[PDB]
Write a protein that binds this ligand. Structure first.
Ligand SMILES: NC(=O)c1ccc[n+]([C@@H]2O[C@H](COP(=O)([O-])OP(=O)(O)OC[C@H]3O[C@@H](n4cnc5c(N)ncnc54)[C@H](OP(=O)(O)O)[C@@H]3O)[C@@H](O)[C@H]2O)c1
Length: 280
């Protein structure tokens, strides 16, 4: 029976879809707009807008399993349609922020908990995949790295443990295709905790040139982030980074435990995405 991959044009969703197609599995790729390009080959395109959960009734026909992105505003509608269609297993792309002690006050933590909890209460089989910082967050430095050798960082000494999107897709695929993952919640990290400055330098090494952070003052960083995210989220980002300033973050072996392969390094990630950081 079919697997519905929501967000099949997304960074993670497209890799989940592609990997399932490589395995011979019938995949429906969920998109908000059927007219647009970017869907991997061999995927049946279906409208599946998680904010308009009446699209889901058609998208879930003949579907046994679902990969789900976190969209809190339509979760009760999703649960209802998944139950009605006979879905047996939902794998959710959540966040490690749900595991920290302030999760239910943190905007990011709350956003993901608002989808985890109704799934937990629904009776559907589930697996939660809970990454720490996405390696792809480094793509926000591309404009500065393309144009010069200095990047401006709010907290150059702040640690995260960035995880490669391919590893996330591999864990999702394991959860969709093998037994033993029911009610599992996998906290995913990369294999090394790294500061912002270290990440920037590793991008430099992949390019063959020395790229450095300079610190920007918090006034300036707050302003930049207030143009990209709501007020509450900027406060959490900066507070999160200040709390990890000079404090190495936890490295978990969860990727290796699930997939049998060590987590991909940020260096490898930078080599994989090197074209994003070269000038036009
Ligand atoms: N950034 C971090 O450090 C971090 C850490 C932990 C967890 N996370 C989680 O990872 C996510 C990022 O995943 P990603 O890298 O794959 O992002 P992405 O490349 O931006 O893809 C996001 C996908 O979500 C889909 N989507 C959004 N709203 C939808 C809706 N209403 N209905 C259907 N599909 C919808 C989009 O579909 P369309 O392309 O069709 O529009 C898009 O394909 C975050 O949202 C968060 O939940 C992030």
């Amino acid at each position: 029976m079919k697997i519905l991959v929501t967000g099949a044009r997304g960074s993670i969703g497209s890799r989940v879809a592609g990997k399932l197609v490589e395995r011979g599995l019938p995949v429906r790729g969920g998109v908000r707009d059927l007219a647009a390009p970017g869907l991997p080959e061999g995927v049946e395109a279906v409208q599946a807008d998680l904010t308009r959960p009446e699209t889901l009734a058609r998208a879930l026909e003949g579907v046994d399993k679902v990969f789900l992105y976190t969209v809190p505003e339509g979760i009760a509608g999703f649960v209802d349609e998944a139950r009605a269609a006979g879905v047996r297993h939902v794998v959710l792309l959540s966040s490690i922020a749900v595991t920290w002690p302030d999760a239910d006050r943190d905007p990011i933590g709350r956003m993901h908990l608002a989808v985890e909890r109704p799934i937990e209460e629904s009776g559907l089989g589930w697996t939660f995949v809970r990454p720490e910082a996405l390696a792809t967050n480094a793509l926000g430095w591309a404009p500065e790295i393309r144009g010069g050798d200095m990047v401006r960082c709010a907290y150059p000494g702040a640690y995260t443990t960035p995880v490669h999107e391919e590893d996330i897709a591999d864990v999702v695929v394991a959860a969709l295709t093998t037994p033993g993952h029911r009610s599992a919640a996998y906290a995913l990290t990369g294999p090394e905790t790294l500061t912002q400055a270290e990440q920037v330098a590793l991008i430099g090494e992949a390019l063959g040139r020395a790229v450095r952070c300079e610190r920007m003052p918090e006034q300036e960083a707050r302003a930049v982030l207030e143009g990209l995210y709501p007020a509450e989220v900027v406060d959490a980002i900066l507070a999160g980074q200040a709390a990890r300033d000079g404090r190495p973050a936890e490295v978990l072996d969860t990727i290796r435990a699930v997939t049998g392969r060590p987590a991909r390094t940020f260096r490898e990630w930078a080599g994989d995405h090197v074209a994003a950081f070269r000038p036009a």
